[PDB]
Structure 1
Amino acid sequence: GRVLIAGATGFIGQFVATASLDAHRPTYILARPGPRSPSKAKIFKALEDKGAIIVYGLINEQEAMEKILKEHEIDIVVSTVGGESILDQIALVKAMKAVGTIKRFLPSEFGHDVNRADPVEPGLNMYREKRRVRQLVEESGIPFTYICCNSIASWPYYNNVLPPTDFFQIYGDGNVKAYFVAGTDIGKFTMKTVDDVRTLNKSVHFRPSCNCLNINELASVWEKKIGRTLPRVTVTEDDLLAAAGENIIPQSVVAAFTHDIFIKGCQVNFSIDGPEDVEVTTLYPEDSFRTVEECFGEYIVK
């Protein structure tokens, strides 16, 4: 089962590609043509060494993607492209339909369930773009898996690194829960799901109980780590709405999501006991997530 990955130089994409390569799956990385960045070379260098095969294309040139999928015999397409590139997948989806041999498509999700969450603008528009990709995928009869992996384990700043060494900003009353997952757990479990029968045409929700925290709890973890207490200030819902209301890309969008998670609780306000939803810890029992304690642990390094 040959895996094509788009956006593997991305923040998420770097975690997923390494995981695929570590799972000793056959991995192709879609790369942009022409000369490249310094951090970009450090990624392509490492992936190639881990066995990665580099193919050159763009995901919005439909024709190019057809020649790429056909020639390299691709079973599985994982797209990890950033939030400004979401509508560029529309040509990729058209391409996958044309060649008709695809066993699984993962669109660029890696957040919340976009069909359940209702964020304010301009976060809302991003979700519109994602929902539209969903509609297109399903109508095209392509087999899919949606990664709803919630929050990457970093400090949850309003704009967007190291948690605050000065004072803590607590959203609302700070008693609203979220799920936090290590970058490496996002990639590893992602790659497990791709050819699991139980994830065919499903949303996969990452809900590890040990990593289910509110910002007060999350601040307290950080204080154990540093050995002393920092002050806590309240950032209000209104503070958040005002930052969203400025339409500054991408500062304003992150702010809409922050309102969705920590004011409105979008990550935890829905059941997953239905038949189109599955949860990672129950699909892979007795297989541990990394705790925020150990994630934050390594933030002390440096």
Structure 2
Amino acid sequence: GRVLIAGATGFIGQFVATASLDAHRPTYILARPGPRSPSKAKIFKALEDKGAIIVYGLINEQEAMEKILKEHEIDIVVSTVGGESILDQIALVKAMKAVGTIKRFLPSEFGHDVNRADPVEPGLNMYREKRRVRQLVEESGIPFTYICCNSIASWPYYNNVLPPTDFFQIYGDGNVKAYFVAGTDIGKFTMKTVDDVRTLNKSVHFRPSCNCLNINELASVWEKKIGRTLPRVTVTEDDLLAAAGENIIPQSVVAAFTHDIFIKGCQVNFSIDGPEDVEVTTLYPEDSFRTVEECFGEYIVK
């Protein structure tokens, strides 16, 4: 099963691409034509050394994408494009529909369940775009999997990776749970889903029970790691709504999602027992997630 990843030089994309190559899956990486940044240069080299095949194009160019999917006999398409580029996926979906040979598409999800969560603006606009892509995918008859992996295991700053050394900003009561997942686990478990019969036309939720922490708990894990306590200060709901209300992109987007998670409980407030939802830890039993303690341990080694 040949995998095409768009957005492999991106934050999430680097983890997904590396996991695909480490799983011994034939892996093709879409590259923007032109000169290469030092960091892009770094990433593309690492991936090619792991056996990645670089292909040149842009996902908003339908005819170009049709040619690539056909020429390279692609089976599985994974998009990890950024928030600014969500509607660039429209041409890619039309291209996949035209070629008709795609076995699984994973659009650029990699956070919350955009069909259940209701963030304030401008987070909401991003979710409108993601929902529009899901509507197009489903109406196009493309088999899909939606990766709802919740938060990457970093410190959740309102404007956003390394936890604080001076004082902790605690959102609201600091007693609202979220799920934190290592980057490497987002990649590993994403790639397992692409050809699993059980994830076909499903939302895949990442709910590792040992990494279900509120902000007060997350603070305490960091204090254990640095061997000292810090002052805790409150950031109110209205603080976050003010920040969101300025409509400064992407800072205000991050503020809106912080509010949704840590004020409104968007990651934990629904059941996954229904027939269109599956959960990673029950799909792949006896395959432990890296803990937050472990993750914070490598931030310490920096």
The runs of at least 4 aligned residues of structure 1 exceeding 4 Å deviation read none
SS at match of 2:81: coil
Q: Secondary structure at the match of 1:170?
A: strand
Q: Which whole-Å deviations, capped at 9, do the CAs of 1:112-156 have from their partners, x for residues lacking one?
A: 000000000000000000000000000000000000000000000
Partner secondary structure for residue 294 of structure 1: helix
Q: Shift of residue 41 of structure 1?
A: 0.3
Tell me how far apart the structure 2 counterparts of residues 2 and 184 of structure 1 sit (CA, whole Å).
21
**Distance in 2 (alpha carbons) for counterparts of 1:162 and 1:97:** 42
C-alpha separation between the residues in 1 aligned to 2:226 and 2:264?
A: 30
User: Matches of 2:205 and 2:162 in 1, distance apart?
Assistant: 26
- 1:29-69 Cα distance to aligned partner (Å, 9 max, x none): 00000111000000000000000000000100000000100
Within 1, Cα distance between the matches of 2:232 and 2:184? Answer: 30
The SS at the match of 1:256 is: helix
Q: Deviations over 1:70-128 (max 9, x none)?
A: 00000000000000000000000000000000000000000000000000000000000
TM-score, reference length from structure 2: 1.00
* 1:141-184: CA deviation from partner (whole Å, max 9, x where unpaired): 00000000000000000000210000000000000000000000
The Cα offsets for residues 269-302 of structure 1, whole Å up to 9 and x where unpaired, read as 0000000000000000000000000000110012
Distance 1:106 1:18 in 2: 16
State the alpha-carbon separation in 2 of the partners of residues 153 and 24 from structure 1. 26
Q: Secondary structure at the match of 2:114?
A: coil
Scaled by the length of structure 1, what TM-score is found? 1.00
Instruction: Give how far 1:236 is off.
Output: 0.1
Q: Partners in 1 of 2:205 and 2:72 — Cα distance? A: 31
- Partners of 1:8 and 1:196 in 2: how far apart? 22
Aligned residues: 302
> C-alpha separation between the residues in 2 aligned to 1:224 and 1:34?
46
* CA distance in 2: counterparts of 1:61 and 1:236, whole angstroms: 44
Query: Shift in Å at residue 218 of structure 1?
Result: 0.4
Alignment of 1:118-157 (within 5 A): 118-157=118-157
- Residue 2 (structure 1) shift: 0.1
Structure 1 counterpart SS, 2:91: helix
**C-alpha separation in 2, matches of 1:161 and 1:127:** 23
Instruction: Provide the rounded CA distance (Å) in 1 between the counterparts of 2:205 and 2:86.
Output: 21
Report the 3-state secondary structure (helix = DSSP H, G, I; strand = E; otherwise coil) of the residue aligned with 1:180: strand
| Residue 197 of structure 1: how far off its partner (Å) | 0.2
CA offsets 1:237-286 (integer angstroms, 9 cap, x no match) = 00000000000000000000000000000000000000000000000000
CA distance in 2, matches of 1:221, 1:170: 14
- Mapped to 1, the partners of 2:114 and 2:286 lie a distance apart of 29
CA distance in 2, matches of 1:58, 1:227: 47
SS at match of 2:4: strand
SS at 1:14 equivalent: helix
Alpha-carbon RMSD across the aligned residues, in angstroms, is 0.3
CA distance in 2, matches of 1:128, 1:83: 11
